[PDB]
């Protein structure tokens, strides 16, 4: 039986989604300063 | 909701790379970047102020 | 052969989307401007220190 | 069975390359700031 790695991938999406929030908020902070 | 297949070792590589971003990105992207930009504008204005102050005194 | 695992197609598409957004925006923060700002801050701090020490050593009142 | 799954391995391999390079940028930038501060 082929293993189902869907839940692993869903966890990576949650992780990268949070990292993208941090990137966007940091970028907008530096954008607003200058 | 169909499935696709992926070589197991390649998905393992992807997980490793994602976890490295988790580990180190917050050690750069934090409040210290904006703080550095703000402090620089503050000290620059204080320098120019004290430069003119010393000029009017000597 | 090398073993396969299966993944719901839509969840892999989401992963791709999130990876490409990092691609798009991370280099617009991570570049030489961060280090340059820290280097510039340390330089002006020393120049302000040396300008305050000149005012402190001056007898003017 | 008669129906088989699409192979998305090459897509994943491309994502690995993308993230590997982003990690190179994170590590180099982090070390630069580390070396100065």
Author numbering:
A (entry chain B): 540 to 573
B (entry chain C): 22 to 79
C (entry chain A): 21 to 81
D (entry chain D): 537 to 573
Give the article text.
BRME1 (BRCA2 and MEILB2-associating protein 1; also known as MEIOK21, MMER, C19ORF57 and 4930432K21Rik) was then identified as a meiosis-specific binding partner of MEILB2. The particular adaptations of meiotic recombination require several additional meiosis-specific components. These include the MEILB2–BRME1 complex, which binds directly to BRCA2 and is essential for the correct localisation of RAD51 and DMC1 recombinases to meiotic DSBs.
Here, we identified an optimised construct for crystallography, which includes the α1 helix and the beginning of the α2 helix of MEILB2 (amino-acids 22–81; herein referred to as MEILB2α) and the core of BRME1’s MBD (amino-acids 540–578; herein referred to as BRME1MBD). The β-cap binds together the N-termini of the two α1 helices of the four-helical bundle, so likely prevents the fraying apart of helical ends that typically occurs within coiled-coil structures. At this point, there is a slight ‘kink’ in the MEILB2 chains, between α1 and α2 helices, where L50 and N51 adopt non-helical conformations due to a single amino-acid insertion into the heptad repeats. Thus, DNA binding is mediated by the rigid β-cap at the N-terminal tip of the MEILB2–BRME1MBD structure.
